[PDB]
Amino acid sequence: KETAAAKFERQHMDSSTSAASSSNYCNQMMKSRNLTKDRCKPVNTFVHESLADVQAVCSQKNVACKNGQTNCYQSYSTMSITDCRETGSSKYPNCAYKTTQANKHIIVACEGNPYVPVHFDASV
Numbered sequence: 001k002e003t004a005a006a007k008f009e010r011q012h013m014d015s016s017t018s019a020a021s022s023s024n025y026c027n028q029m030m031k032s033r034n035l036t037k038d039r040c041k042p043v044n045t046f047v048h049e050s051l052a053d054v055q056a057v058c059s060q061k062n063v064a065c066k067n068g069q070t071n072c073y074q075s076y077s078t079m080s081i082t083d084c085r086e087t088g089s090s091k092y093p094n095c096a097y098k099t100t101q102a103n104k105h106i107i108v109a110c111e112g113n114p115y116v117p118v119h120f121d122a123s124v
Protein backbone atom coordinates (compact mmCIF):
# COMPACT_ATOMS: atom_id res chain seq x y z
CA LYS A 1 0.00 0.00 0.00
CA GLU A 2 1.41 3.38 1.22
CA THR A 3 1.64 4.83 4.76
CA ALA A 4 0.41 8.35 5.50
CA ALA A 5 4.03 9.46 6.02
CA ALA A 6 5.02 8.00 2.61
CA LYS A 7 1.99 9.63 0.96
CA PHE A 8 3.07 13.02 2.36
CA GLU A 9 6.56 12.44 0.94
CA ARG A 10 5.13 11.52 -2.49
CA GLN A 11 2.71 14.44 -2.62
CA HIS A 12 4.78 17.15 -0.98
CA MET A 13 8.54 16.52 -0.91
CA ASP A 14 10.98 17.45 -3.66
CA SER A 15 14.39 17.87 -2.05
CA SER A 16 16.23 17.17 -5.36
CA THR A 17 15.67 20.71 -6.67
CA SER A 18 16.80 23.77 -4.69
CA ALA A 19 14.62 26.49 -6.25
CA ALA A 20 14.85 26.42 -10.06
CA SER A 21 11.41 24.99 -10.91
CA SER A 22 10.83 25.70 -14.60
CA SER A 23 7.48 26.77 -16.04
CA ASN A 24 7.09 23.05 -16.91
CA TYR A 25 7.73 21.89 -13.35
CA CYS A 26 4.18 21.51 -11.99
CA ASN A 27 2.92 19.96 -15.21
CA GLN A 28 5.61 17.27 -14.97
CA MET A 29 5.59 16.79 -11.20
CA MET A 30 1.83 16.64 -10.69
CA LYS A 31 1.78 13.79 -13.24
CA SER A 32 4.95 11.96 -12.08
CA ARG A 33 3.82 11.97 -8.44
CA ASN A 34 0.45 10.49 -9.41
CA LEU A 35 -1.60 13.54 -8.42
CA THR A 36 -3.43 13.60 -11.77
CA LYS A 37 -4.61 9.97 -11.97
CA ASP A 38 -8.22 10.22 -10.73
CA ARG A 39 -8.67 13.97 -11.29
CA CYS A 40 -6.55 17.09 -11.59
CA LYS A 41 -5.61 17.82 -7.97
CA PRO A 42 -6.44 21.56 -7.85
CA VAL A 43 -3.68 22.82 -5.51
CA ASN A 44 -0.49 21.09 -4.36
CA THR A 45 2.76 22.28 -2.79
CA PHE A 46 6.25 20.76 -3.10
CA VAL A 47 8.91 21.52 -0.46
CA HIS A 48 12.57 21.80 -1.49
CA GLU A 49 14.19 21.27 1.88
CA SER A 50 15.62 18.07 3.28
CA LEU A 51 13.27 15.41 4.62
CA ALA A 52 14.94 15.84 8.03
CA ASP A 53 14.21 19.59 7.99
CA VAL A 54 10.54 19.09 7.06
CA GLN A 55 10.13 16.28 9.61
CA ALA A 56 11.63 18.64 12.23
CA VAL A 57 8.64 20.96 11.75
CA CYS A 58 6.54 18.54 13.89
CA SER A 59 8.58 19.77 16.92
CA GLN A 60 8.24 23.47 16.00
CA LYS A 61 5.42 26.06 16.41
CA ASN A 62 2.06 24.39 17.24
CA VAL A 63 -0.76 26.19 15.39
CA ALA A 64 -4.40 25.42 14.64
CA CYS A 65 -5.05 23.46 11.46
CA LYS A 66 -7.46 24.91 8.91
CA ASN A 67 -9.91 22.13 9.80
CA GLY A 68 -9.81 23.06 13.50
CA GLN A 69 -7.68 20.14 14.63
CA THR A 70 -4.75 21.05 16.88
CA ASN A 71 -1.93 18.94 15.40
CA CYS A 72 -0.49 21.48 12.97
CA TYR A 73 2.99 22.97 13.14
CA GLN A 74 4.53 26.03 11.49
CA SER A 75 8.21 26.10 10.51
CA TYR A 76 10.26 28.70 12.40
CA SER A 77 12.33 29.33 9.27
CA THR A 78 11.11 30.00 5.76
CA MET A 79 11.44 27.10 3.35
CA SER A 80 11.87 26.92 -0.42
CA ILE A 81 8.56 25.70 -1.93
CA THR A 82 6.79 25.42 -5.27
CA ASP A 83 3.03 25.88 -5.45
CA CYS A 84 1.12 24.14 -8.22
CA ARG A 85 -2.27 25.60 -9.09
CA GLU A 86 -4.55 24.14 -11.78
CA THR A 87 -5.11 26.57 -14.69
CA GLY A 88 -8.60 27.72 -15.71
CA SER A 89 -8.38 25.91 -19.06
CA SER A 90 -6.92 22.67 -17.65
CA LYS A 91 -9.07 19.69 -18.62
CA TYR A 92 -8.54 16.18 -17.26
CA PRO A 93 -6.72 13.97 -18.26
CA ASN A 94 -4.51 16.81 -19.57
CA CYS A 95 -4.02 18.55 -16.25
CA ALA A 96 -2.30 21.92 -16.58
CA TYR A 97 -0.69 23.94 -13.80
CA LYS A 98 0.91 27.26 -13.02
CA THR A 99 4.30 26.81 -11.33
CA THR A 100 5.14 29.39 -8.63
CA GLN A 101 8.24 29.39 -6.43
CA ALA A 102 8.15 30.96 -2.96
CA ASN A 103 10.06 31.15 0.30
CA LYS A 104 7.52 30.83 3.08
CA HIS A 105 6.85 29.24 6.43
CA ILE A 106 5.11 25.92 5.96
CA ILE A 107 2.31 24.51 8.10
CA VAL A 108 1.97 20.72 8.26
CA ALA A 109 -0.22 18.29 10.24
CA CYS A 110 1.72 15.63 12.18
CA GLU A 111 0.59 12.19 13.41
CA GLY A 112 1.92 8.87 14.57
CA ASN A 113 4.90 7.31 16.26
CA PRO A 114 7.31 8.54 15.08
CA TYR A 115 5.54 11.90 14.93
CA VAL A 116 5.90 12.91 11.29
CA PRO A 117 4.18 15.09 8.66
CA VAL A 118 1.05 13.52 7.13
CA HIS A 119 -0.66 16.58 5.53
CA PHE A 120 0.38 19.90 4.07
CA ASP A 121 -1.96 22.53 5.51
CA ALA A 122 -0.74 25.93 4.29
CA SER A 123 2.15 28.26 3.65
CA VAL A 124 2.34 31.68 5.31
Ligand SMILES: O=c1ccn([C@@H]2O[C@@H](CN3CCOCC3)[C@H](O)[C@H]2O)c(=O)[nH]1
Binding pocket: 011, 043, 044, 045, 119, 120, 121, 122, 123
Ligand atom coordinates in the same frame (compact mmCIF):
# COMPACT_ATOMS: atom_id res chain seq x y z
O1 LIG B 1 -0.91 25.64 0.28
C1 LIG B 1 -1.48 24.56 0.11
C2 LIG B 1 -2.83 24.39 0.44
C3 LIG B 1 -3.43 23.16 0.20
N1 LIG B 1 -2.70 22.07 -0.35
C4 LIG B 1 -3.35 20.74 -0.62
O2 LIG B 1 -4.80 20.89 -0.53
C5 LIG B 1 -5.07 20.54 0.87
C6 LIG B 1 -6.50 20.40 1.41
N2 LIG B 1 -7.50 20.93 0.49
C7 LIG B 1 -8.38 21.83 1.26
C8 LIG B 1 -9.62 22.19 0.44
O3 LIG B 1 -10.27 20.98 0.01
C9 LIG B 1 -9.42 20.22 -0.88
C10 LIG B 1 -8.21 19.76 -0.07
C11 LIG B 1 -4.35 19.22 0.95
O4 LIG B 1 -4.19 18.69 2.26
C12 LIG B 1 -3.00 19.64 0.41
O5 LIG B 1 -2.55 18.46 -0.23
C13 LIG B 1 -1.36 22.26 -0.70
O6 LIG B 1 -0.68 21.35 -1.17
N3 LIG B 1 -0.78 23.50 -0.47
